[PDB]
Write an enzyme that holds these catalytic residues in place. Structure first.
Site, short mmCIF file in Angstrom:
data_model
loop_
_atom_site.label_atom_id
_atom_site.label_comp_id
_atom_site.label_asym_id
_atom_site.label_seq_id
_atom_site.Cartn_x
_atom_site.Cartn_y
_atom_site.Cartn_z
N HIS A 61 38.86 -72.77 17.94
CA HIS A 61 37.86 -71.77 17.57
C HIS A 61 38.12 -71.17 16.18
CE1 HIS A 61 36.34 -72.09 21.61
NE2 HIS A 61 37.54 -71.81 22.10
N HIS A 91 43.72 -63.96 12.33
CA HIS A 91 42.89 -65.15 12.19
C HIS A 91 41.70 -64.78 11.33
CE1 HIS A 91 41.15 -62.97 15.61
NE2 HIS A 91 40.01 -63.32 15.05
N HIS A 93 37.33 -65.71 10.31
CA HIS A 93 36.01 -66.23 10.66
C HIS A 93 35.40 -66.57 9.30
CE1 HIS A 93 36.09 -64.65 14.83
NE2 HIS A 93 36.89 -63.77 14.27
C1 LIG Z 1 39.59 -67.53 20.96
C2 LIG Z 1 39.87 -66.37 21.90
N1 LIG Z 1 40.04 -65.15 21.15
C3 LIG Z 1 40.06 -63.85 21.81
C4 LIG Z 1 41.08 -63.71 22.93
C5 LIG Z 1 42.51 -63.55 22.40
C6 LIG Z 1 43.52 -63.70 23.54
S1 LIG Z 1 42.66 -61.95 21.57
O1 LIG Z 1 43.97 -61.95 20.62
O2 LIG Z 1 42.48 -60.76 22.65
C7 LIG Z 1 41.23 -61.90 20.54
S2 LIG Z 1 41.05 -60.86 19.28
C8 LIG Z 1 39.53 -61.40 18.91
S3 LIG Z 1 38.57 -60.72 17.59
N2 LIG Z 1 37.63 -61.95 16.93
O3 LIG Z 1 37.56 -59.70 18.27
O4 LIG Z 1 39.64 -60.10 16.56
C9 LIG Z 1 39.13 -62.42 19.75
C10 LIG Z 1 40.12 -62.75 20.75
ZN LIG Z 2 38.20 -62.40 15.08
#
Ligand SMILES: CCN[C@H]1C[C@H](C)S(=O)(=O)c2sc(S(N)(=O)=O)cc21
Ligand SMILES: [Zn+2]
Length: 257
Positions: A61, A91, A93
């Protein structure tokens, strides 16, 4: 499985994750004229001097840089937060074109990418417990605009060749996240959610007003990654962003005027 394609993208997520149509979903558009200055907001306290990075992973992702969160090494405090939040990963986007990529928007303006530094509230003991609480996570969002190169980002760009496909990971130690911060820490904040499934409403969003600049060549490297695993049809990892969601009964606060 959920993703960002025409058949499994954001418009479909509600079927498997009904909270997608919830009351405090993210991202949102930040209307700079309706956000309210709150003088009771404290400045952010970012202590990343003792950060210990461990690995970089392509999870299908995006790509995540993970840190050791067994102790209070790299933490975020202050701002609208109560307590200490530990950095666990960051990460990005990004888009297929420079004019799109960010999740949050500012007066409908989209940036080339958006950086998320994810932190969890230590009062809950472990990350898994934190995500089940309304104040369990704090995510620091930083916009990326295309311009001059960001030297601190280069070490990340250079290792992407080693994690091109889903499931690949590489050791990534001694990376200092301070190199990714803008000069000013002025911010907007509002209560929201994860922007990808499970879409849990456990996040206090802190979005920095000042974008960081990265070069065209740096972002181009992001776009060479693959959503797919090795041995599978190649699908470029681009446009891994969720569009803006309704603000509903929420107010966006600003730390500055
Ligand atoms: C791909 C799954 N990602 C999820 C689950 C992970 C376990 S997390 O670190 O709770 C997290 S943080 C964000 S964001 N885009 O709102 O910063 C998305 C996600
Ligand atoms: Zn994010």
């Amino acid at each position: 499985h959920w993703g960002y394609g025409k058949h499994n993208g954001p418009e479909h997520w509600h079927k498997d994750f009904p909270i997608a149509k919830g009351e405090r979903q993210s991202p949102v558009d930040i209307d700079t004229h309706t956000a309210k200055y709150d003088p009771s907001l404290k400045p952010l306290s970012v202590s990343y001097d003792q950060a210990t990075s461990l690995r970089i992973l392509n999870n299908g992702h995006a790509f995540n840089v993970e840190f050791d969160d067994s102790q209070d090494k790299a933490v975020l405090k202050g701002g609208p937060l109560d307590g200490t939040y530990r950095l666990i990963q960051f990460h990005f986007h990004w888009g297929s074109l420079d004019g799109q990529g960010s999740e949050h928007t500012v007066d409908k303006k989209k940036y080339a990418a958006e950086l998320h530094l994810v932190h969890w509230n230590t009062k809950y003991g472990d990350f898994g417990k934190a995500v089940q609480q309304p104040d369990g996570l704090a995510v620091l969002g930083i916009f990326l605009k295309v311009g001059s190169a960001k030297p601190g980002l280069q070490k990340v760009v250079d290792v992407l060749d080693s994690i091109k496909t889903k499931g690949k990971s590489a050791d990534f130690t001694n990376f200092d996240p301070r190199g990714l911060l803008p000069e000013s820490l002025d911010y907007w904040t509002y209560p929201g959610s994860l922007t990808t499934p499970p879409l849990l409403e456990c996040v206090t969003w802190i979005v920095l007003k000042e974008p960081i600049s990265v070069s065209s060549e740096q972002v181009l490297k992001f776009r060479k990654l693959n959503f797919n695993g090795e041995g599978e049809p190649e699908e470029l990892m681009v446009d891994n962003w969720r569009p803006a969601q309704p603000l509903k009964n929420r107010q966006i606060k600003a730390s500055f005027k």
